[PDB]
C-alpha cells in the first residue's frame, strides 16, 4: 500500500528503515550493537588495535615514497661500489608497499570485525519460471509480430534474404584471406642461407646451387664499442660470427654445433680482411630455423661398432659424424650428447637418439631417426658439406613421406 506525506512524517527513522528493507523482501532477523556498555574499556581497547595498523599504513606509505625517491636504484655489476644498495631497491619497494597496503586492509577488516554491528539478513528469492501471464503475453506479442509482418508467406523473399545475408557475411569476412598463405609457395627472390622458406629446405640446400658451404663454428663474438671525437659507436666490421673449422679440432667424444657458412661470407684465415662486414649475414645463418648441425667425433672403439643406414653410408668422414640438431619430435635442439653412452638427449620431452644406430630414437615420444648430413674435407682441409640432407629436417607434418 501507499503512504501519504503525513504518514511518512509520523514515522521514526528506524521505522522508515524497516519499511525500506521490507519493500525488497529483505528482513533483518537479528541485529545487535558491538559495545552497548556506555564507556566500555573494550571499545577503547579495540580502537587502539585499529589505530596500530593505520599508523603502520602511514609509516609504510611514507617509507615507500622515501625508498622510491632517494634509494640508489641504478644498475650495478659485481664488484661495483654500492652493489648491495642496488640489489635491495626492488625488495624495499615491495616490503614498504606491502606494509602500507596490507596494514590499511587489516585496519578495515578489524573495524568491520569489531565496530560495525552484526546482523542476520534474510532475502526472499524470485526465480524459476516467470508468472505465466508474462510468458503468455510475451509469446503473444512475438507471435503477433511475426504473423503481422507477413514474411512467413513469402518463401522467395525469405530464401533470397537469407542468401543475401549469408553472402554479405562472406563479403565481410572474405578479406581474412589476406592472412592465408600457401606454405609451398617459396619465399621471394633466390634461395637464401636459410633456404627458400618452405618446410623442405635449409641453408644446406645451397650445395645444390654449386655453392661451397663450409661447416662453420660459432665464435660467439660481440660488437665492439669504438669511440672517437664524433661519439661512441658499436660496430661489427671486422668481426666474424662463424668461422671455418678443421678436422683436427675436436677430440674424440667431442660435439660441436656448426652452421652453414658459404664461401662468400667467410672472413678468416690468412685471407682475412679487417674491413669485410659479414657479421650480418653469418647472423642470418645462425638464426636459420633448421640450420643447426651437431658434429660429433666418435672414439675409434665406438666407430668400430657404429651401424649405418641405407643410403647414408659414406656420409661420415672417418670418425666424424653429423646429424641435424633439430629434434624429430616437435623441434627442440637435441643438444645433450651423453659422451659415454653415445646417446643424444633432447631436454624438452626426454627423447634419446642412438648415435651408434644412425640416430634412431630409443626412448621418448620421438619416432624418426635424426637426419644425417654428408660431410668431407676440401683441398685446404676444412670440413665442408659434401651434399644436402636426404630427408626433410625438423618435426613431422602431414605432407611428409615416412
Ligand X SMILES: CCCCCCCCCCCCCCCC(=O)O[C@H](COC(=O)CCCCCCC[C@@H](C)CCCCCCCCC)COP(=O)(O)O[C@H]1[C@H](O)[C@H](O)[C@H](O)[C@@H](O)[C@@H]1O
Ligand Y SMILES: CCCCCCCCCCCCO[C@@H]1O[C@H](CO)[C@@H](O[C@H]2O[C@H](CO)[C@@H](O)[C@H](O)[C@H]2O)[C@H](O)[C@H]1O
Q: Give the residue numbers of the binding site for [2Fe-2S] cluster.
A: 327, 329, 346, 349
349 vs 400 by CB, closer to ligand SMA: 349
Q: What is the rounded CA–CA span in Å between residue 390 and residue 107?
A: 72
Rounded alpha-carbon distances, angstroms, from residue 213 to 31, 99, 381: 87, 63, 13
Helix (H) / strand (E) element for 216: namely strand 213-218
197 vs 387 by CB, closer to other proteins: 197
Site for ligand IZL contains 391 (CB under 6 A): yes
Site for ligand SMA contains 104 (CB under 6 A): no
Q: Identify what 72 binds: ligand Y, ligand X, its own copies, none; CB under 5 to 8 Å per kind.
A: none
Q: Identify what 237 binds: its own copies, ligand IZL, ligand SMA, none; CB under 5 to 8 Å per kind.
A: its own copies
Q: What is the rounded CA–CA span in Å between residue 224 and residue 210?
A: 35
Q: What is the rounded CA–CA span in Å between residue 206 and residue 261?
A: 10
Binding mask 177-216 for ligand IZL (x = CB under 6 A): ---x---x---------------xx---x--x--------
262 DSSP 8-state letter: E
| CB of 90 vs ligand Y, minimal distance in Å | 41
Q: What is the rounded CA–CA span in Å between residue 38 and residue 33?
A: 12
299 DSSP 8-state letter: -
Binding mask 146-175 for its own copies (x = CB under 8 A): --xxxx--x-xx--xx-xxx-xx-xx--xx
Please give the residue whose beta carbon sits closest to ligand IZL in the complex: 200
Instruction: List the one residue out of 262, 267, 280, 264 whose CA is nearest residue 203.
Output: 262
| Contact in structure between 256 and 243 (CB atoms under 8 Å) | no
Establish how many alpha carbons lie within 13 A of residue 399's alpha carbon, considering only the half-sphere containing its beta carbon: 7
Within residues 197-236, the interface with other proteins by CB under 8 A covers 197-199, 218, 222-225, 234, 236
Instruction: Return the C-alpha cell found at 18.
Output: 524497516
In sequence order, which ranges of 174-292 are alpha helices (DSSP H)?
279-286
Residues in contact with ligand X by CB under 6 A are 69, 174, 177-178, 180-182, 185
Within residues 246-305, the interface with its own copies by CB under 8 A covers 262, 264-265, 275-277, 281
Site for other proteins contains 91 (CB under 8 A): yes
Interface contacts to ligand SMA, rule CB under 6 A: 348-349
Interface contacts to ligand IZL, rule CB under 6 A: 180, 184, 200-201, 205, 208, 388-392, 398-401
Amino acid at each position: 500500500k501507499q503512504y501519504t506525506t503525513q504518514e511518512l512524517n509520523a514515522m521514526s527513522n528506524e521505522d522508515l528503515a524497516r519499511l525500506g528493507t521490507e519493500l525488497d523482501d529483505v528482513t533483518i532477523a537479528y541485529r545487535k550493537e558491538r559495545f552497548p556498555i556506555a564507556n566500555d574499556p573494550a571499545e577503547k581497547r579495540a580502537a587502539r588495535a585499529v589505530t596500530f595498523w593505520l599508523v603502520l599504513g602511514i609509516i609504510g606509505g611514507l617509507g615507500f615514497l622515501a625508498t622510491y625517491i632517494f634509494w640508489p636504484w641504478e644498475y650495478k655489476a659485481h664488484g661495483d661500489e654500492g652493489l648491495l644498495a642496488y640489489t635491495l631497491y626492488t625488495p624495499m619497494l615491495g616490503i614498504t608497499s606491502g606494509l602500507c597496503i596490507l596494514s590499511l586492509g587489516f585496519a578495515v577488516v578489524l573495524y568491520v570485525k569489531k565496530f560495525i554491528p552484526e546482523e542476520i539478513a534474510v532475502q526472499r528469492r524470485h526465480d524459476g519460471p516467470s508468472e505465466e501471464v508474462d510468458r503468455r503475453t510475451i509469446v503473444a506479442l512475438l507471435n503477433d509480430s511475426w504473423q503481422t509482418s507477413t514474411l512467413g508467406r513469402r518463401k522467395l523473399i525469405m530464401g533470397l534474404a537469407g542468401g543475401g545475408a549469408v553472402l554479405a557475411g562472406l563479403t565481410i569476412i572474405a578479406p581474412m584471406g589476406g592472412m592465408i598463405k600457401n606454405p609451398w609457395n617459396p619465399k621471394e627472390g633466390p634461395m637464401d642461407v636459410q633456404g627458400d622458406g618452405t618446410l623442405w629446405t635449409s641453408g644446406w640446400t645451397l650445395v645444390e646451387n654449386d655453392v661451397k658451404v663450409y661447416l662453420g663454428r660459432d665464435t660467439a663474438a660481440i660488437a665492439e664499442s669504438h669511440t672517437d671525437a664524433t661519439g661512441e659507436h658499436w660496430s661489427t666490421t671486422g668481426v666474424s660470427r662463424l668461422v671455418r673449422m678443421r678436422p683436427e679440432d675436436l677430440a674424440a667424444a667431442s660435439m660441436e654445433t656448426v652452421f652453414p657458412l658459404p664461401a662468400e661470407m667467410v672472413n678468416d684465415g690468412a685471407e682475412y680482411d679487417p674491413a669485410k662486414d659479414v657479421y650480418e649475414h653469418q647472423m642470418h645463418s645462425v638464426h636459420g630455423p633448421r640450420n643447426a648441425v651437431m658434429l660429433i667425433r666418435l672414439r675409434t672403439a665406438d666407430a668400430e661398432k657404429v651401424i649405418e643406414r641405407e643410403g647414408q653410408e659414406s656420409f661420415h668422414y672417418g670418425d666424424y659424424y653429423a646429424y641435424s640438431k633439430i629434434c624429430t619430435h616437435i623441434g627442440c635442439p637435441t643438444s645433450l650428447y651423453e659422451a659415454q653412452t653415445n646417446r643424444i638427449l633432447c631436454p624438452c620431452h626426454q627423447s634419446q637418439f642412438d648415435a651408434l644406430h644412425y640416430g634412431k630414437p630409443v626412448f621418448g615420444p620421438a619416432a624418426r631417426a635424426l637426419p644425417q648430413l654428408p660431410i668431407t674435407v676440401d683441398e685446404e682441409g676444412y670440413l665442408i658439406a659434401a651434399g644436402n640432407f636426404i630427408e626433410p629436417l625438423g618435426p613431422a607434418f602431414w605432407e611428409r613421406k615416412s
